[PDB]
Amino acid sequence: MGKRMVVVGGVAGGASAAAKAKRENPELEVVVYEKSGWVSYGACGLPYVLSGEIPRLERLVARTPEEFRKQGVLVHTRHEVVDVDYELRTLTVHDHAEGRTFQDRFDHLVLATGARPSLPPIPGTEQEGVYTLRTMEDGERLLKALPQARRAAILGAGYIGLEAAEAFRKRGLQVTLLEAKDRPLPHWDPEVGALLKEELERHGVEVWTGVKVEAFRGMGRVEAVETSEGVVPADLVLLATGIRPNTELAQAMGVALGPTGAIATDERMRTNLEGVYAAGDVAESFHRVLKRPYWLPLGDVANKHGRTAGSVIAGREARFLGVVGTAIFKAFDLAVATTGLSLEGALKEGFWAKKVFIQSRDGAHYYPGSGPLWVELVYEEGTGRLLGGAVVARGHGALRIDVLAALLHREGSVEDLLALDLAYAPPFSPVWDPLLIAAQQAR
Amino acid sequence: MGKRMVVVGGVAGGASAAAKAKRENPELEVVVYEKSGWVSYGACGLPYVLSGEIPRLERLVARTPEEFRKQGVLVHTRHEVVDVDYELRTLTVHDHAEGRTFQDRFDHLVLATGARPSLPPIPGTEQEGVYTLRTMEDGERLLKALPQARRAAILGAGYIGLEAAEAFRKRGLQVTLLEAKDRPLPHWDPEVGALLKEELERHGVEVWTGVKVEAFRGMGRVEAVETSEGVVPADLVLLATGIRPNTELAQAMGVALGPTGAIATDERMRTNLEGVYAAGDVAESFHRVLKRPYWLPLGDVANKHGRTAGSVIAGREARFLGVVGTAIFKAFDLAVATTGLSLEGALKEGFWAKKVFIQSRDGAHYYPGSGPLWVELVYEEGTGRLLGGAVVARGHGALRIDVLAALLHREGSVEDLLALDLAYAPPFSPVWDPLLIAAQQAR
């Protein structure tokens, strides 16, 4: 028809959804209500702004509320949707401006409220040089504190967090990372974690492994971090201890949560309620190797979510077919790419799973400047089915991970990876592509 | 058993076979006869040595006749097998050393004699500044001529040749490329070729298109290149006008040629004669999009051919499943990768084929130093079947082509491409990988 789409949250799933919806069916009244007062910005670039590589923080926005308006889309920042009157039956949508508070109705609802820092229960968190990195505001805050170094503490060695320490080190602070688990990037096989310790340490970052963080010392300021392994002086600390999906609002209106705790969806991004979709980080995506719902709070998947809901509302045929887990991030001079399951995890799932980890180059043995390039392959013993792999490079690609993800997608195997006709030339690959050498091929 | 394997030609198909067979069954008597007096070197790197980027020419050999010996493998360079007494009945092998000339017998024969420059019929080629780039010796020659610039002409705008122009400009000569067809890289869709003219011109290479070269002017030296479009002063000229497989020896012995002119082989690399195999550039490979024999004189495929013959001979189970056409090469600040069919050629084959050519980036809009990145997609109208694609980057990878190859392998479609879970992060890719945007996705 010519109905009214309301998008709650407009960072990435939300923005995505609204832009595509309005493009595909211009007859729709498309409204976005955004709590944070910036909308359509890539958080994924925050470390690069902090580090100073990117001059001003506004350089992260993809579309401004102006451009949106100029394109049929009305966005309202610093608007919080407080209640939804659902089913029940759409009055729905009470929300709060600056000054006021009011009512709206919808015919289509997109929930794209995202996710918020999960905080470990530590005394002192509440204080003053303790920071989080997740929004534009966090950006501003952190960015103010940064000149005037002097010494930083990052709890958690996940992708953000490792990303963080680069940023920090580039700003001159002395940084020290505290992770609770035994390696950096604990969510993945230890080889990789190893490589990253080395590179962290190579660059001046101190890395405490297996640390229980007891509390943050300060009189409302902060200066310490007392830990089981001693006491780290620090005058800024960052919590990079994971996220959790913002589902409070969804549960108000009785939208069903899946096993992971994010909003349960179908291939159309629909929730359990007629006319209500979910998209981005408050959403479950379906994992194709695991063959079940799974949480994958990445930027690319938020965009896919959004675009499918939009498309579907706009009355196009569109379906989101699931994810396989592929991720990549940059810590210093390493580029770390994983996908699927790790061997650790392929085993939790009960496969009879072996891993292989090799180290090759990113160019012919003889070619100037050719780096190192490792690739892992996690596979099912009997069949040979791929289930996971990583590749790490210096390279602004490799990225070669994309192939694995490809093979993962349909249920490919090590035999298949072996058959592939890859690209060879002295600047970019040895004669046998790392992926190929890793295939069966060397133990 | 413990028979005798004779490898004619030991550049890459051959070397690969010898090393693999002797590793896999050390019982074998493995002998490699090689005409050129260098063996196991990478021709692929020659531009890099010509350019000065790589110091000495010997930096390109992968294994020395010494390391081979030390490993059970006896190589004899400067030895040319002049006849084979086959079937007939293996006396077989007459060949020529320094001084002498003798007999040998075989149980296993690998033909890996490769390819030679295909020479166009122009008067004055026979002369003195006219050079070819294929073997190490060509290396040496060219390497000698090169200081003492002054002005070069290259005939042909293929990969080598384009690669050659980079090389020559790097050594300071003024270079001017002559192609007969209308674009550089004429063997692909015109968008790519366009991209390359701009980049070669941007770097001081003059590119003549649609040129008929009439003769090379000189009194045994060379100084000109008379062409339809006028007269190019040149004191070194390079013929980069393609190659043709070295099959003379094989025909002698009554090995069947395929429709391409290369030696016809099966999935085990066996020729039509019992006990005789072929590897590398003298070999047809099976094109999996075209479903027929095809000729793909690349080095990564020679190694595949080589390893397969060797493994089969040594008595392991091995099969060569085919290629899909994947190629990559570097020309200045561009890295150009292709695969499958071009639209031009997908149409020659009679598919109802469309193309799509998009320009994206190699990293988020906002990320420092993010380059451009183009990608094309040649697909069948109905089905959505991928048939070909290209990608061009500055990047040391993207290399992203590897994905299309992957999809090309089983008969993957644009729908499949679209489902793929690719890696995102700001330094390496926009939030939609270029592959994905290109998928259906923008016209």
Ligand SMILES: Cc1cc2nc3c(=O)[nH]c(=O)nc-3n(C[C@H](O)[C@H](O)[C@H](O)COP(=O)(O)OP(=O)(O)OC[C@H]3O[C@@H](n4cnc5c(N)ncnc54)[C@H](O)[C@@H]3O)c2cc1C
């Ligand atoms: C430092 C950092 C680095 C990252 N790097 C990468 C990377 O390299 N690669 C990658 O793929 N991903 C990366 N990500 C992840 C990425 O931020 C997310 O997965 C993505 O932005 C998804 O957005 P979304 O629209 O679901 O919601 P979110 O981005 O979580 O935002 C939703 C917004 O909606 C608002 N909202 C919440 N509740 C309400 C309510 N009740 N009413 C109205 N509005 C509300 C919130 O205030 C919030 O700011 C990174 C993230 C961070 C923080």
Ligand SMILES: Cc1cc2nc3c(=O)[nH]c(=O)nc-3n(C[C@H](O)[C@H](O)[C@H](O)COP(=O)(O)OP(=O)(O)OC[C@H]3O[C@@H](n4cnc5c(N)ncnc54)[C@H](O)[C@@H]3O)c2cc1C
């Ligand atoms: C300048 C240049 C750049 C290149 N760049 C790339 C690239 O970027 N990527 C890529 O994949 N490929 C590239 N290649 C391709 C590559 O060189 C070949 O496809 C590869 O080396 C295959 O070798 P082969 O073993 O089949 O035989 P070849 O390498 O052609 O050599 C066979 C050798 O055996 C000898 N021989 C011939 N006849 C007889 C006989 N009757 N008796 C005894 N011995 C004999 C010959 O003298 C010859 O030197 C490039 C090639 C060149 C020349």
Ligand SMILES: *SCCNC(=O)CCNC(=O)[C@H](O)C(C)(C)COP(=O)(O)OP(=O)(O)OC[C@H]1O[C@@H](n2cnc3c(N)ncnc32)[C@H](O)[C@@H]1OP(=O)(O)O
């Ligand atoms: S145009 C360029 C192509 N032609 C070239 O000349 C380039 C080099 N090619 C050659 O001349 C032949 O490939 C040679 C080197 C003569 C034959 O070499 P091998 O068959 O001996 O190959 P390798 O020794 O390189 O590898 C054989 C085994 O080594 C394993 N392997 C290689 N590299 C690694 C790394 N980085 N990590 C772990 N393992 C590695 C291969 O897996 C292979 O294993 P097998 O299963 O034992 O064959």
Ligand SMILES: *SCCNC(=O)CCNC(=O)[C@H](O)C(C)(C)COP(=O)(O)OP(=O)(O)OC[C@H]1O[C@@H](n2cnc3c(N)ncnc32)[C@H](O)[C@@H]1OP(=O)(O)O
């Ligand atoms: S953590 C980072 C993820 N979140 C971000 O904020 C990153 C940016 N994302 C957004 O906020 C949303 O994606 C926005 C920008 C709000 C929604 O954007 P649109 O949905 O309008 O996206 P685009 O205009 O970028 O693309 C839409 C159509 O444009 C085509 N297209 C994109 N890029 C190219 C290039 N380089 N060449 C040709 N075409 C291109 C897409 O194909 C798309 O096609 P349709 O089929 O028309 O939708």
Ligand SMILES: CC1=CC(=O)c2ccccc2C1=O
């Ligand atoms: C390990 C290794 C072995 C090679 O033979 C080789 C040949 C050509 C390019 C690169 C390589 C390489 O990295």
Ligand SMILES: CC1=CC(=O)c2ccccc2C1=O
């Ligand atoms: C064209 C284009 C559009 C985006 O919305 C975008 C968003 C985040 C990173 C990169 C890009 C990009 O290159």
